[PDB]
Design a protein around this ligand. Structure first.
Ligand SMILES: Nc1ncnc2c1ncn2[C@@H]1O[C@H](COP(=O)(O)OP(=O)(O)OP(O)(O)=S)[C@@H](O)[C@H]1O
Ligand SMILES: Nc1ncnc2c1ncn2[C@@H]1O[C@H](COP(=O)(O)OP(=O)(O)OP(O)(O)=S)[C@@H](O)[C@H]1O
Ligand SMILES: Nc1ncnc2c1ncn2[C@@H]1O[C@H](COP(=O)(O)OP(=O)(O)OP(O)(O)=S)[C@@H](O)[C@H]1O
Ligand SMILES: [Mg+2]
Ligand SMILES: [Mg+2]
Ligand SMILES: [Mg+2]
Lengths: 728, 249
């Protein structure tokens, strides 16, 4: 019925108003790629735009831009009425006026900087009373046509004249400020945004339906993550993208009030939220007002916590009130708050990955003008511990550095510079490099949950263990039907043992990469220092974090350091089991089987590994990684020399047959020494840029073997008899 | 356009008023090493000084001393208008008077201790209403000429007579106290001072520009270090070297 209704959701094209439909839709609605379409919304208003051909979007959805989302007064998830408009349009006169809320501080002829290089080669349609956003000059202003030929009958054409007036019109309350934060202002958190939408917008957008059904709405969403990850930004965006009254409660602001006055503020906020329609209560920095009652001094703080608990428990389904909270220290929150009925849904806003931080960089530089040498992908790759706030600071510092070199072209005597020079100031890649040079990443110490970049091409040889790892990891996560057909529960653990430098870490990272699963690396020294504070909850948090990242691989590297804390199995007579290892075994035994978490351990001291690790059900897949043989050495050398300009005369198989007991690390050291000799040759010749055969010969002259023959024999002995271990 | 505007920043010569320019500038402005130059600032006031030949300073910058920085009522990062003055000058009478805010506790003939071994072998120019600083006697006092021949038409010469009056004049609010802490009162922290300048003075000196751009200013500067390292001194200096209202907590 009525094949003209479209579901409204945010678009992905980072441009002006351009709607995107699915493959069957443009054929069903007989419109082509470059066609003019008409959008009809509520409150008797229209919008005109140009469609885009998309296939991999969805089965039935339109894509709606935020620029003209407010033009139709429609929010996310709304239903729109489309209509093809095969009417030829051409503009003759379009009286256009900005709004004096975002154009303050800009002078001069704004057309040649903002409107001229935005109209041509676009051919966009303009309707009566359209508010379209134009970026440029390191700021964004929205623009408004107020008078033209009868609506719409207008497209962007070179034959359209324009004239400035110099008196921008004020903004009325009928429209929402486009300068406010929306869904498009958040980068690197789309899964979290999807969860928040699914848990929030349906009850809020349809309060009557949710009241009619009589089902429990999630009213205890709790955002948490490292500081500066955009928790407040996400909450404000969710508030703005829905027609829900938003009441903001600040932790420190409440705590700064006098005793007996903060409780009044909390009660007033909850009363306002209950009274005013569906509403969202956001309590930023929840740990400020509600820490653990076991660790708190004053009775006023405990009164505050009890009042918050009472207010949370006094929430009814009929109230249609959703309480959201943000905290960078989730473990400091009082446990009574995180129970059922108060804060049950927990959303982890983690550190963005490379793609996410690239998206954040684009979001923060979309206002700025970038020089042609600016490679935002390179900047994202070079920033590891940065968060959204860190990237915003980096972009601001780059802009300030660009200004600092433009103090002469900009008349500092002049009160308010004009935009014809501001756009001429462009941020170079050198400015970004300088800003990145002096920047302090806040999330350096945070554990990384990400898909590693190293693939099988970075590993030479080891084909059999590659196949075994594929069968152990990919198959249970890709074909569960075969496993339940044959009745075998997949093994959840693998232990890597062998001589050092043979690729135990690379194998785990590569198998994580191939499955496209999250990878968490916990090293033995890290465990030994993180337990020295007697914090038993940290290694539990590691397993909890791995649980939410399923499918995930939890890799414990350098287990020898853990096993060497108390000497080993024999040692002086005592056992090496202490501290973390018992809790690690407990966590391994207490993890759900249906969860897709895979645990991999690595050690180059199989003699001192404690037997309880090897028990079936914890780590029973014993995989032995030996020293590379002749062909594996060739493969390792080729893998290590992918990034270097190796000369043609270099015989890699000759080097492989000249090295017998060398491991992968030894071959990497040989390659690095040869490259360093080449660098020295280049430096000397400066006062040629191809690493040669002679460099490899000289490096091989000083090449050293890092595994003894007796060590090889002992590893071969353990390669055959390690399942025994446990028992005596 | 107008090859006469100079960017004002602190000098490195630890002496009286001596301006320092870059290598191309004295050739571009046809002035030599020992030449008399005229400095013109805001609020319709002038200053006269002697240039210095420098090469490894910068590409385009003048070097401005704190003694006569307040003489032009110009702060750090300001734009000044220079002019060569190939006019022969010689002083005949210069009625000079100290200021009774820094000369208290000093008696006797202050000329033979302060002004006599400061004038000769220098040949410095003096303008109308100049406040120049003289150090000596384990204290520093600033000095003020109030009456002389028409401005400036005066350089330091042995043929210039002087007479004491014994009644120093009070200091008005039009000028800033040179006894206050400035950038030259901090030693051993130039990288930190450079960072503080880059993070502070541009937003403060150009608030309208920073409001027009709509970019984030660093507003949370936190100084830290061992006690007695001059954190308070640095903060007060940054306050004084910029025309920003300073509130101390
Ligand atoms: N994911 C993101 N996408 C875009 N901008 C971001 C993102 N995360 C942070 N920012 C920027 O960094 C600023 C700081 O983020 P906030 O949300 O205010 O910090 P926070 O998440 O509340 O963490 P706190 O308050 O320090 S515990 C935001 O106002 C944005 O400008
Ligand atoms: N099969 C391999 N192919 C290519 N490089 C390898 C290989 N095995 C080891 N390497 C090199 O050796 C380095 C160390 O790799 P790892 O996986 O950490 O070895 P390991 O078995 O874990 O022993 P350690 O204690 O970590 S050196 C890698 O960064 C490579 O440079
Ligand atoms: N770098 C410096 N250059 C010149 N004088 C300095 C310097 N550091 C300290 N002083 C002198 O030592 C005095 C004491 O320095 P203050 O700035 O008052 O101490 P502080 O830096 O505030 O550290 P506190 O107050 O003990 S935590 C200053 O008033 C100066 O006279
Ligand atoms: Mg917050
Ligand atoms: Mg390793
Ligand atoms: Mg102090």
């Amino acid at each position: 019925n009525r094949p003209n209704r479209l579901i409204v959701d945010e678009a992905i094209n980072e441009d002006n108003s351009v709607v995107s439909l699915s493959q069957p839709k443009m054929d069903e609605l007989q419109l082509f790629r470059g066609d003019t379409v008409l959008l009809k919304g509520k409150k008797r208003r229209e919008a005109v735009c140009i469609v885009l051909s998309d296939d991999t979007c969805s089965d039935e959805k339109i894509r709606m831009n935020r620029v003209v989302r407010n033009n139709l007064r429609v929010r996310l998830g709304d239903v729109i009425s489309i209509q093809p408009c095969p009417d030829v349009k051409y503009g003759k006169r379009i009286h256009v006026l900005p709004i004096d809320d975002t154009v303050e501080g800009i002078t001069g002829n704004l057309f040649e900087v903002y409107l001229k290089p935005y109209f041509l080669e676009a051919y966009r349609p303009i309707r009566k009373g359209d508010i379209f956003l134009v970026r440029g000059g390191m700021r964004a202003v929205e623009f408004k046509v107020v008078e033209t030929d009868p609506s719409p009958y207008c497209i962007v054409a070179p034959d359209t004249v324009i004239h400035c007036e110099g008196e921008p019109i004020k903004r009325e309350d009928e429209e929402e400020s486009l300068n406010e934060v929306g869904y498009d202002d958040i980068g690197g958190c789309r899964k979290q945004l999807a969860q928040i939408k699914e848990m929030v917008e349906l009850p809020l957008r349809h309060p009557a339906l949710f009241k009619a059904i009589g089902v429990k709405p999630p009213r205890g969403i709790l955002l948490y993550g490292p500081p500066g990850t955009g928790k407040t930004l996400i909450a404000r965006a969710v508030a703005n993208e829905t027609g829900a009254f938003f009441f903001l409660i600040n932790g420190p602001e409440i705590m700064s009030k006098l005793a007996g006055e903060s409780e009044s503020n909390l009660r007033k906020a909850f009363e306002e939220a209950e009274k005013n329609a569906p509403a969202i209560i956001f309590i930023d920095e929840l740990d400020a007002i509600a820490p653990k009652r076991e660790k708190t001094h004053g009775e006023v703080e405990r009164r505050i916590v009890s009042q918050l608990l009472t207010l949370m428990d006094g929430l009814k389904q009929r109230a249609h009130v959703i309480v959201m909270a943000a905290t960078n220290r989730p473990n400091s929150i009082d446990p009574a708050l995180r129970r059922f009925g108060r804060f049950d849904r927990e959303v982890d806003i983690g550190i963005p990955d490379a793609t996410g931080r690239l998206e954040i960089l684009q979001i923060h530089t979309k206002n700025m003008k970038l020089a042609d040498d600016v490679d935002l992908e390179q900047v994202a790759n070079e920033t590891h511990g940065h968060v959204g706030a860190d990237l915003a600071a980096l972009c601001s510092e780059a802009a300030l550095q660009a200004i600092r070199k433009k103090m002469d072209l900009i008349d500092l005597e002049d009160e308010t510079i004009d935009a014809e020079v501001m756009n001429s100031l462009a941020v170079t890649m050198d400015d970004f490099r300088w800003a990145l040079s002096q920047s302090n990443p806040s999330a350096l110490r945070e554990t990384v949950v990400d898909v590693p970049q190293v693939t099988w091409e970075d590993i030479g040889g080891l084909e059999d263990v590659k196949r075994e790892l594929q069968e152990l990891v990919q198959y249970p996560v890709e074909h569960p039907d075969k496993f339940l057909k044959f009745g075998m529960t997949p093994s959840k653990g693998v232990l890597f043992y062998g001589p050092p430098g043979c690729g135990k870490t690379l194998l785990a990272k590569a198998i994580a990469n191939e499955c496209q699963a999250n990878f968490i690396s916990i090293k033995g020294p890290e465990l030994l220092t993180m337990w020295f504070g007697e914090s038993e909850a940290n290694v539990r948090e590691i397993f909890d974090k791995a649980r939410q990242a399923a499918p995930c691989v939890l890799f414990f590297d350098e287990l020898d350091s853990i096993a060497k804390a108390r000497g080993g199995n024999i040692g002086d007579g005592g056992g090496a089991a202490d501290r973390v290892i018992n809790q690690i075994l407990t966590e391994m035994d207490g993890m759900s089987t249906k969860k897709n978490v895979f645990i991999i351990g690595a050690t180059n001291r199989p003699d001192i590994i404690d037997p309880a690790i090897l028990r079936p059900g914890r780590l029973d897949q014993l995989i032995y990684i030996p020293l590379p043989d002749e062909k594996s050495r060739v493969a390792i050398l080729k893998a290590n020399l992918r990034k270097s300009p190796v000369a043609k005369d270099v015989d890699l198989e000759f080097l492989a047959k000249m090295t017998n007991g060398f491991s992968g690390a030894d071959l990497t050291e040989i390659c690095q020494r040869a490259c360093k000799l080449a660098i020295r040759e280049s430096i000397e010749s400066e006062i040629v840029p191809e690493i040669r055969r002679d460099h490899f010969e000289e490096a091989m002259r000083f090449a050293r073997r890092s595994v003894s023959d007796n060590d090889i024999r002992k590893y071969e002995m353990f390669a055959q008899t390690l399942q025994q271990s446990r028992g005596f």
